[PDB]
Design a protein around this ligand. Structure first.
Ligand SMILES: CC(C)[C@H](C)n1cc(-c2cc(C(C)(C)O)n(C)n2)c2[nH]nc(N)c2c1=O
Length: 281
């Protein structure tokens, strides 16, 4: 008799490494607390100011399309225990599997469902990329890696953070690149980029950073963020992917409205994506 959210190191046996989450390596573990021979698979992220904020946030969320908090283990450091999403990320999935257009439109829809909820709870994700969206057994999107997620203070529209280390700047709106201000609408921009990725089946050669650097026309370096910002401010965007319908590119372009106030909300995007998914099913 005790708290299920408390995980004990003696019953966690590591199967393998899964990947590098932002601010923490994720691994796969078998948790057999009752020694019944089977236990359960779980994902475990090792964390070292806001270095716990991913646990603080993710434990307050309950939704089918957001990866589910299970508990913690601190037997200095901390291990976030999450559900194991067994098919991994879309970035590594889509290039290795054949996937139709409607199925892609359905993954996009699910992301919006999860993100509408997230924003309702007054959080921003700040890391919405195909790489951080995971598939379960039924090919259901679970949104993951809340390493950069923040609580938007109440009454406010954005949150200001200048990340001392790496961040996904090729998924980031100009206000993010320029003012380090992250609105709810900024996550919609990232979703837009995430949908571009979907439709390119995450071909690395067509990936947002590959594309954006070609368009900038200058080699990667200290001035890139500035040039990317000036490029996006001139209204250039990622190209319509091959065999992507015009109507679906328009959706991406609307999520890519330069000024953040003119972008769709995740609420607004849900009916639209259902209707467009229907049209191509
Ligand atoms: C969201 C990413 C950044 C992290 C690393 N991540 C990865 C996985 C995963 C990775 C794989 C492979 C294909 C082997 O690399 N699989 C099958 N699953 C995973 N599963 N469940 C989770 N919560 C979870 C996760 O967070």
């Amino acid at each position: 008799a005790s708290d299920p959210t408390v995980f004990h190191k003696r019953y966690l046996k590591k199967i393998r490494d899964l990947g590098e989450g932002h601010f923490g390596k994720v691994s796969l573990y078998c948790y057999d607390p009752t020694n019944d021979g089977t236990g359960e698979m779980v994902a475990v992220k090792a964390l070292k100011s806001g270095w716990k904020q991913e646990i603080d946030i993710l434990r307050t969320l309950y939704h089918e399309h957001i990866i589910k908090y299970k508990g913690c283990c601190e037997d200095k450091s901390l291990q976030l225990v999450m559900e194991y999403v067994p098919l991994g990320s879309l970035r590594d999935y889509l290039p290795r599997h054949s996937i139709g257009l409607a199925q892609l439109l359905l993954f996009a829809q699910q992301i919006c469902e999860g993100m509408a909820y997230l924003h309702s709870q007054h959080y921003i994700h700040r890391n919405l990329a195909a790489r951080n969206v995971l598939l379960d057994n039924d090919r259901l999107v679970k949104i993951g890696d809340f390493g950069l997620a923040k609580a938007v203070p109440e009454g406010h529209e954005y949150y200001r953070v200048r990340e001392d280390g790496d961040s996904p700047v090729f998924w980031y709106a100009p206000e993010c690149l320029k003012e380090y201000k992250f609105y709810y609408a900024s996550d919609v921009w990232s979703f837009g980029v995430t949908l571009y990725e979907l439709l390119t089946h995450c071909d690395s050669s067509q990936s947002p950073p590959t594309k954006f650097l070609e368009l900038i026309g200058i080699a990667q370096g200290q001035m890139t963020v500035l040039r990317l910002t000036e490029l996006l401010e001139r209204g250039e965007r990622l190209p319509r992917p091959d065999k992507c319908p015009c109507e679906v590119y328009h959706l991406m372009k609307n999520c890519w409205e330069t000024e953040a106030s003119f972008r769709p909300t995740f609420e607004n995007l849900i009916p639209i994506l259902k209707t467009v998914h229907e049209k191509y099913h």
